[PDB]
């Protein structure tokens, strides 16, 4: 079986700059009869199937923008995006079709935009009365439209730092403005919620000091 190995696993490049991704095959995919390399490149955006970009190592698929190009031969190949656009954020896969069963794919390279630092807007949401009737209280903190992806969220209840009772998730990089958003949920019992100020404290590159967003249950 021909094993395909991609590098790097992720690459961040400024808008309009060059992005290059590497693919190596465990054996040559160049056919000597013709002079063709049996290698293709695909682009996959979130929630979509992969899209064919390049085949025969260097032929662009019909309709693919000119900024996508492929090169290389034998065992080592590269895909180049000559001027990275915000919409090009995607995972890119190489694939060999030289030795069928089985066709094999590389592990993918995530291409991201590098942009200027953007601090998050921080908002907080109290639990609904409807959820409180069920025995649990979820408090939600939202960090909207920030860059880079790394952010620290700390929950405090009556100024006491919490651990082990929150979960968070982060969006994929926005194809338009190249930022991220993050949602963190603090889950407590109704009883615990009723016995105590609820605060989300956010630390992020784009901030000079931590931002704390909070409310008083008494006035929701």
């Amino acid at each position: 079986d021909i094993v395909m190995t991609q590098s790097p696993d992720s690459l961040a490049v400024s808008l309009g700059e060059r992005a290059t991704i590497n693919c190596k095959s465990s054996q040559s995919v160049l056919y000597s009869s013709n002079n063709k390399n049996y290698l293709a490149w695909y682009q996959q955006k979130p929630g979509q199937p992969p899209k064919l970009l390049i085949y025969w190592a260097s032929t662009r698929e019909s309709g693919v923008p000119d900024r996508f190009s492929g090169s290389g031969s034998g065992t080592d190949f590269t895909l180049t995006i000559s001027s990275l656009q915000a919409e090009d954020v995607a995972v890119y896969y190489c694939q060999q079709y030289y030795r069928t069963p089985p066709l094999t794919f590389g592990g993918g390279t995530k291409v991201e935009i590098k942009r200027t630092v953007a601090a998050p807007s921080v908002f907080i949401f109290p639990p609904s009365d409807e959820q409180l009737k069920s025995g649990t209280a979820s408090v939600v903190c939202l960090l909207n439209n920030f860059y880079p992806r790394e952010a620290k969220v700390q929950w405090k209840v009556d100024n006491a730092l919490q651990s082990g009772n929150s979960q968070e998730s982060v969006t994929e990089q926005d194809s338009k403005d190249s930022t991220y958003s993050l949602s963190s949920t603090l889950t407590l019992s109704k009883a615990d919620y009723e016995k105590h100020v609820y605060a989300c404290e956010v630390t992020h590159q784009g901030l000079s000091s931590p931002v704390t967003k909070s409310f008083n249950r008494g006035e929701c």
Binding site: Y42, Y97, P101
Partner: protein, 220 residues
């Protein structure tokens, strides 16, 4: 234009069976070889199997991990491709793609259908408002949302205003609670002035449990 529409994915217990379908248009179906490819959540692409045309013997071949358990077939009179999956294992959990391009350059892909193999039972979500307030607004914009709690399996679809509201929406990746159930939030940012006009409703569909919930999201 070529079209490949898949259906048939869902939740199935280990050792169970499932049939996937791929309905085609826009090319001569009887002349096409087809491949199935799968992608486990957050992972790479894995070939599953191939079926030839009847002219080339209609032969099938399969990736080693599914050989003996999966069967590919085609119904040329309905222009539909199938994958019959037997003796299902947890590691078969994936999005399954039908593809075509004959030399194996995968130029056309269906949209994907998710197969989840698990012994846990289906459970529909509870849906709670994330109410806008003085604590969710900055610069003339306000955030509001819905919290979709305690469901199994993935996925849920969250719409706003029955699909009429699309700009400014962030639906976050679900988190897996220690209970084995998923939760997610969907937030939308709107002009603050529109909260004095407009009703905002989140429409939550959890097809595995036949659960649909519409929750009005009012300021607090």
């Amino acid at each position: 234009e070529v079209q490949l529409v898949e259906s048939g994915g869902g939740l199935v217990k280990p050792g169970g069976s499932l049939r996937l379908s791929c309905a085609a248009s826009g090319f001569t179906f009887s002349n096409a070889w087809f491949n199935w490819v799968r992608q486990a959540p957050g992972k790479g692409l894995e070939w599953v199997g191939r079926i030839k045309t009847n002219t080339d013997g209609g032969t099938t071949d399969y990736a080693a991990p599914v050989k003996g358990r999966f069967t590919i077939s085609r119904d040329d009179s309905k222009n539909t491709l199938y994958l019959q999956m037997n003796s299902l294992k947890t590691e078969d959990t994936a999005v399954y793609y039908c593809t075509t391009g004959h030399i194996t350059i995968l130029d056309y892909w269906g949209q994907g259908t998710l197969v989840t193999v698990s012994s846990a039972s289906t459970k529909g979500p509870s849906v709670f408002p994330l109410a806008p307030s003085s604590k969710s607004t900055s610069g003339g914009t306000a955030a509001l949302g819905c919290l979709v709690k305690d469901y199994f399996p993935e996925p849920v679809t969250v719409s706003w205003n029955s699909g009429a509201l699309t700009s400014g929406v962030h639906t976050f990746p679900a988190v897996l609670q220690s209970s084995g159930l998923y939760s997610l939030s969907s937030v939308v940012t709107v002009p603050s002035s529109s909260l004095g006009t407009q009703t905002y409703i989140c429409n939550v569909n959890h097809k595995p449990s036949n659960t649909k919930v519409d929750k009005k999201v009012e300021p607090k």
